Design an enzyme around this catalytic site. Structure first.
Site, PDB file in Angstrom:
ATOM      1  N   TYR A   1      16.856   2.582   3.627  1.00 48.53           N
ATOM      2  CA  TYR A   1      15.896   3.498   4.187  1.00 48.53           C
ATOM      3  C   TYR A   1      14.817   2.830   5.053  1.00 48.53           C
ATOM      4  CZ  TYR A   1      12.464   2.106   0.895  1.00 48.53           C
ATOM      5  OH  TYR A   1      11.565   1.406   0.213  1.00 48.53           O
TER       6      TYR A   1
ATOM      7  N   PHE B   1      11.744   9.828   6.930  1.00 49.99           N
ATOM      8  CA  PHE B   1      12.648   8.791   6.458  1.00 49.99           C
ATOM      9  C   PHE B   1      14.016   8.866   7.145  1.00 49.99           C
ATOM     10  CE2 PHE B   1       9.868   9.479   2.932  1.00 49.99           C
ATOM     11  CZ  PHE B   1       9.632   8.285   2.402  1.00 49.99           C
TER      12      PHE B   1
ATOM     13  N   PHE C   1       5.938   2.537   7.655  1.00 47.02           N
ATOM     14  CA  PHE C   1       5.235   2.174   6.462  1.00 47.02           C
ATOM     15  C   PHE C   1       6.046   1.357   5.444  1.00 47.02           C
ATOM     16  CE2 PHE C   1       6.398   6.550   5.659  1.00 47.02           C
ATOM     17  CZ  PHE C   1       6.979   6.467   4.479  1.00 47.02           C
ATOM     18  N   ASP C   2       7.353   1.506   5.431  1.00 48.16           N
ATOM     19  CA  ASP C   2       8.206   0.763   4.547  1.00 48.16           C
ATOM     20  C   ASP C   2       9.641   0.779   5.025  1.00 48.16           C
ATOM     21  OD1 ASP C   2       8.971  -0.647   2.213  1.00 48.16           O
ATOM     22  OD2 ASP C   2       9.174   1.125   1.098  1.00 48.16           O
TER      23      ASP C   2
ATOM     24  N   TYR D   1       4.112  13.187  -1.632  1.00 46.98           N
ATOM     25  CA  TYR D   1       3.038  12.706  -2.496  1.00 46.98           C
ATOM     26  C   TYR D   1       1.858  13.674  -2.613  1.00 46.98           C
ATOM     27  CZ  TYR D   1       5.761   8.518  -2.539  1.00 46.98           C
ATOM     28  OH  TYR D   1       6.759   7.652  -2.691  1.00 46.98           O
TER      29      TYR D   1
ATOM     30  N   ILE E   1      10.616  11.146  -4.866  1.00 47.32           N
ATOM     31  CA  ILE E   1       9.941  12.328  -4.384  1.00 47.32           C
ATOM     32  C   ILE E   1      10.954  13.469  -4.147  1.00 47.32           C
ATOM     33  CG2 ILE E   1       7.952  11.065  -3.434  1.00 47.32           C
ATOM     34  CD1 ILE E   1       9.249  11.312  -0.749  1.00 47.32           C
TER      35      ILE E   1
HETATM   36  C1  LIG Z   1       8.646  -2.229  -3.289  1.00 49.48           C
HETATM   37  O1  LIG Z   1       9.229  -0.988  -2.991  1.00 49.48           O
HETATM   38  C2  LIG Z   1       9.170   0.005  -3.980  1.00 49.48           C
HETATM   39  C3  LIG Z   1       9.328   1.343  -3.286  1.00 49.48           C
HETATM   40  C4  LIG Z   1       8.149   1.823  -2.449  1.00 49.48           C
HETATM   41  C5  LIG Z   1       7.020   2.338  -3.310  1.00 49.48           C
HETATM   42  C6  LIG Z   1       5.947   2.964  -2.448  1.00 49.48           C
HETATM   43  C7  LIG Z   1       6.543   4.046  -1.567  1.00 49.48           C
HETATM   44  C8  LIG Z   1       5.498   4.717  -0.709  1.00 49.48           C
HETATM   45  C9  LIG Z   1       7.716   3.505  -0.758  1.00 49.48           C
HETATM   46  O2  LIG Z   1       7.282   2.624   0.250  1.00 49.48           O
HETATM   47  O3  LIG Z   1       8.609   2.883  -1.643  1.00 49.48           O
HETATM   48  C10 LIG Z   1       8.491   4.619  -0.109  1.00 49.48           C
HETATM   49  O4  LIG Z   1       8.929   4.395   0.947  1.00 49.48           O
HETATM   50  C11 LIG Z   1       8.765   5.884  -0.756  1.00 49.48           C
HETATM   51  O5  LIG Z   1       7.979   6.751  -0.651  1.00 49.48           O
HETATM   52  N1  LIG Z   1       9.871   6.022  -1.438  1.00 49.48           N
HETATM   53  C12 LIG Z   1      10.801   4.950  -1.629  1.00 49.48           C
HETATM   54  C13 LIG Z   1      12.258   5.317  -1.494  1.00 49.48           C
HETATM   55  C14 LIG Z   1      12.620   6.605  -2.159  1.00 49.48           C
HETATM   56  C15 LIG Z   1      11.624   7.661  -1.787  1.00 49.48           C
HETATM   57  C16 LIG Z   1      10.183   7.293  -2.093  1.00 49.48           C
HETATM   58  C17 LIG Z   1       9.943   7.323  -3.574  1.00 49.48           C
HETATM   59  O6  LIG Z   1      10.129   8.293  -4.231  1.00 49.48           O
HETATM   60  O7  LIG Z   1       9.433   6.138  -4.187  1.00 49.48           O
HETATM   61  C18 LIG Z   1       9.177   6.185  -5.573  1.00 49.48           C
HETATM   62  C19 LIG Z   1       7.748   6.639  -5.836  1.00 49.48           C
HETATM   63  C20 LIG Z   1       6.764   5.655  -5.257  1.00 49.48           C
HETATM   64  C21 LIG Z   1       7.440   6.886  -7.293  1.00 49.48           C
HETATM   65  C22 LIG Z   1       8.086   8.103  -7.924  1.00 49.48           C
HETATM   66  C23 LIG Z   1       7.785   9.375  -7.177  1.00 49.48           C
HETATM   67  C24 LIG Z   1       8.431  10.551  -7.867  1.00 49.48           C
HETATM   68  C25 LIG Z   1       7.891  10.672  -9.256  1.00 49.48           C
HETATM   69  O8  LIG Z   1       8.410  11.829  -9.851  1.00 49.48           O
HETATM   70  C26 LIG Z   1       8.279   9.429 -10.023  1.00 49.48           C
HETATM   71  O9  LIG Z   1       7.801   9.535 -11.322  1.00 49.48           O
HETATM   72  C27 LIG Z   1       8.689   8.987 -12.253  1.00 49.48           C
HETATM   73  C28 LIG Z   1       7.631   8.243  -9.360  1.00 49.48           C
HETATM   74  C29 LIG Z   1       9.435   4.759  -6.008  1.00 49.48           C
HETATM   75  C30 LIG Z   1      10.893   4.465  -6.237  1.00 49.48           C
HETATM   76  O10 LIG Z   1      11.709   4.796  -5.447  1.00 49.48           O
HETATM   77  C31 LIG Z   1      11.269   3.723  -7.481  1.00 49.48           C
HETATM   78  C32 LIG Z   1      12.678   3.211  -7.289  1.00 49.48           C
HETATM   79  C33 LIG Z   1      11.242   4.670  -8.634  1.00 49.48           C
HETATM   80  C34 LIG Z   1      10.362   4.583  -9.619  1.00 49.48           C
HETATM   81  C35 LIG Z   1       9.281   3.570  -9.583  1.00 49.48           C
HETATM   82  C36 LIG Z   1      10.354   5.555 -10.744  1.00 49.48           C
HETATM   83  O11 LIG Z   1      11.487   6.360 -10.692  1.00 49.48           O
HETATM   84  C37 LIG Z   1      10.301   4.769 -12.042  1.00 49.48           C
HETATM   85  O12 LIG Z   1       9.778   5.497 -13.104  1.00 49.48           O
HETATM   86  C38 LIG Z   1      10.662   6.465 -13.468  1.00 49.48           C
HETATM   87  C39 LIG Z   1      11.665   4.289 -12.381  1.00 49.48           C
HETATM   88  O13 LIG Z   1      12.388   4.919 -13.062  1.00 49.48           O
HETATM   89  C40 LIG Z   1      12.112   2.997 -11.813  1.00 49.48           C
HETATM   90  C41 LIG Z   1      13.598   3.006 -11.566  1.00 49.48           C
HETATM   91  C42 LIG Z   1      11.745   1.874 -12.748  1.00 49.48           C
HETATM   92  C43 LIG Z   1      11.937   0.510 -12.143  1.00 49.48           C
HETATM   93  C44 LIG Z   1      11.572  -0.502 -13.214  1.00 49.48           C
HETATM   94  C45 LIG Z   1      11.080   0.426 -10.916  1.00 49.48           C
HETATM   95  C46 LIG Z   1      11.480  -0.022  -9.748  1.00 49.48           C
HETATM   96  C47 LIG Z   1      10.608   0.008  -8.594  1.00 49.48           C
HETATM   97  C48 LIG Z   1      10.978  -0.199  -7.345  1.00 49.48           C
HETATM   98  C49 LIG Z   1      10.013  -0.098  -6.274  1.00 49.48           C
HETATM   99  C50 LIG Z   1      10.266  -0.139  -4.983  1.00 49.48           C
HETATM  100  C51 LIG Z   1      11.642  -0.325  -4.500  1.00 49.48           C
END
Ligand SMILES: CO[C@H]1C[C@@H]2CC[C@@H](C)[C@@](O)(O2)C(=O)C(=O)N2CCCC[C@H]2C(=O)O[C@H]([C@H](C)C[C@@H]2CC[C@@H](O)[C@H](OC)C2)CC(=O)[C@H](C)/C=C(\C)[C@@H](O)[C@@H](OC)C(=O)[C@H](C)C[C@H](C)/C=C/C=C/C=C/1C
Length: 119
Positions: free
Chosen positions: A30, A111, A40-41, A93, A67
């Site tokens: 993405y 995206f 932004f990312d 968000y 999201i």
């Molecule tokens: C460095 O890059 C980050 C991603 C960044 C974070 C900040 C945002 C701007 C952003 O730049 O991505 C972005 O572009 C964005 O908005 N994204 C990312 C791609 C998918 C769409 C969106 C999103 O939802 O991010 C997500 C958003 C930020 C948070 C969620 C939003 C929806 C809400 O309902 C959820 O509550 C649960 C939280 C981040 C993610 O895609 C990651 C993968 C998912 C989670 C952290 C949660 O699902 C978490 O708690 C369940 C988990 O189950 C995960 C698997 C646990 C493991 C240990 C964590 C892994 C973390 C990986 C982090 C990564 C790759």
């Protein structure tokens, strides 16, 4: 349920056969951009890690790990599909945005998403 608060435009067609279902784990490349055109990312590597080590985003679809716009959009995509998603703030968000993550308040997010694989 609807109507959806996102739009999808297909940039590259997928296989039109394998669609993710709620609970499947998907893998994606993405790029995220603001309305002003600022990136932004991205998880797409510029070079020398393009394939060597870079790992696509991994998540279980349809369960609120991402999201709302992503979760719903992914369910409409087939493997290999590349799509442009425009997502309203409410399905991203929210009104407040996510400032600590660089997402401004009340802004649509754009995206480009590629669905690499489905487990
Ligand atoms: C460095 O890059 C980050 C991603 C960044 C974070 C900040 C945002 C701007 C952003 O730049 O991505 C972005 O572009 C964005 O908005 N994204 C990312 C791609 C998918 C769409 C969106 C999103 O939802 O991010 C997500 C958003 C930020 C948070 C969620 C939003 C929806 C809400 O309902 C959820 O509550 C649960 C939280 C981040 C993610 O895609 C990651 C993968 C998912 C989670 C952290 C949660 O699902 C978490 O708690 C369940 C988990 O189950 C995960 C698997 C646990 C493991 C240990 C964590 C892994 C973390 C990986 C982090 C990564 C790759």
């Amino acid at each position: 349920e609807g109507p959806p608060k996102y739009t999808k435009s297909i940039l590259k067609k997928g296989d039109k056969t394998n669609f993710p279902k709620k609970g499947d784990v998907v893998h994606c490349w993405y790029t995220g951009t603001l309305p002003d055109g600022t990136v932004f990312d991205t998880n797409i590597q510029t070079s020398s890690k393009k394939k060597k080590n870079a790992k696509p985003l991994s998540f279980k679809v349809g369960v609120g790990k991402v999201i709302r716009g992503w979760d719903e959009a992914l369910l409409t995509m087939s493997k290999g599909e590349k799509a442009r998603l425009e997502i309203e703030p409410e399905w991203a968000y929210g009104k407040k945005g996510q400032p600590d993550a660089k997402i401004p308040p009340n802004t649509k997010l754009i995206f480009e998403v590629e669905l690499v694989d489905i487990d």
